[PDB]
């Protein structure tokens, strides 16, 4: 529910953060996923496949489980289920 305009692909929405870098996806049925990095230049988009985006949010859930709050973990897990399951 945070958003970003790709110059070619139009409106994207954030699936989740990582650290720094963020995962975004296309509004229309998530046909494309993008790894996004910000900087003083600065915003850059790298496409990535659905299976790799899945493993990315999976890794992130593992890190939240070990090192962060239950709330964040529970939020991200709901996002995982709505995005991938």
């Amino acid at each position: 529910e945070n958003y970003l305009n790709h110059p070619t692909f139009g409106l994207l929405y954030q699936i989740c953060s990582f650290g720094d870098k963020e995962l975004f996806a296309t509004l229309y049925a998530q046909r494309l996923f993008f790894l996004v990095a910000f900087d003083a230049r600065g915003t850059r988009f790298e496409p990535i496949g659905r299976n790799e985006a899945r493993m990315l949010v999976d890794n992130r859930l593992r890190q939240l489980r070990r090192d962060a709050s239950l709330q964040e973990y529970n939020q991200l897990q709901q996002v995982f289920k709505q995005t991938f399951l």
Partner: protein, 212 residues
């Protein structure tokens, strides 16, 4: 500033158009290629009735007038290109492309991407129009407008276009009357809001999942 694209051999030119002004008419020579910089350009087919069918609603960074890349100035346009909003763009006569590309071949790839993107966008309108349920067809179209022209807003994504029911009708192969009714149903189902001819779609992500 974007005019950093231009050169001695890509002598591009800025054109601006007030809302509703024509960029090219059917019958005009296909002399130029266009890059839409800001605004929305409507490409349409006009039939003898005066009935108009919208073939594309282009957003910023869209390449158009591509017939010029096949025939050049010799052939005539068969679509109306109009500035749906105020529009700013770069024009270049197409003959200047060969020597442009030879010098900055980075232009070719950029161009190939831009045309590839056009292909995928038109195919999505085909998907939209192929729906038999007229409501499905409207939602799918509004989901495309959210993608191309949407702004985050307190309640969801607002399609940042002031849309007449006629303009919508002409883009989904429907009638003005059928658009009004279907928009009404969508509001009553609490899926969209309408304010000042702007449609806000409350949960465009969740709506799209119902199309898979």
């Amino acid at each position: 500033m974007f005019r950093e694209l231009g050169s001695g051999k890509l002598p591009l030119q800025i054109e601006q158009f007030e809302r509703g002004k024509t960029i090219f008419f059917p019958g005009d020579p296909a002399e130029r290629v266009y890059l839409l910089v800001k605004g929305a350009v409507k490409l349409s087919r006009v039939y003898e009735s005066g009935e108009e069918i919208t073939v594309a609603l282009l957003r910023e960074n869209s390449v158009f007038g591509v017939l010029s890349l096949l025939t050049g100035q010799r052939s005539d346009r068969f679509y109306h290109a109009v500035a749906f909003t105020p529009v700013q763009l770069f024009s270049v006569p197409i003959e200047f492309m060969q020597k442009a590309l030879i010098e900055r071949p980075e232009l070719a790839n950029v161009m190939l991407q831009g045309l590839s993107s056009r292909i995928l966008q038109t195919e999505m309108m085909i998907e939209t129009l192929a729906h038999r349920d007229m409501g499905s067809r409207l939602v799918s179209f509004l989901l495309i407008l959210c993608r191309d022209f949407g702004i985050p807003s307190p309640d969801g994504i607002t399609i940042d276009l002031k849309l007449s029911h006629q303009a919508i009708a002409e883009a989904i192969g429907s009638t003005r009357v059928t658009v009004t009714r279907l928009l009404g149903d969508l509001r009553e189902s609490k899926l969209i809001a309408i304010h000042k001819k702007r449609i806000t779609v409350f949960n465009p992500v969740a709506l799209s999942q119902q199309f898979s």
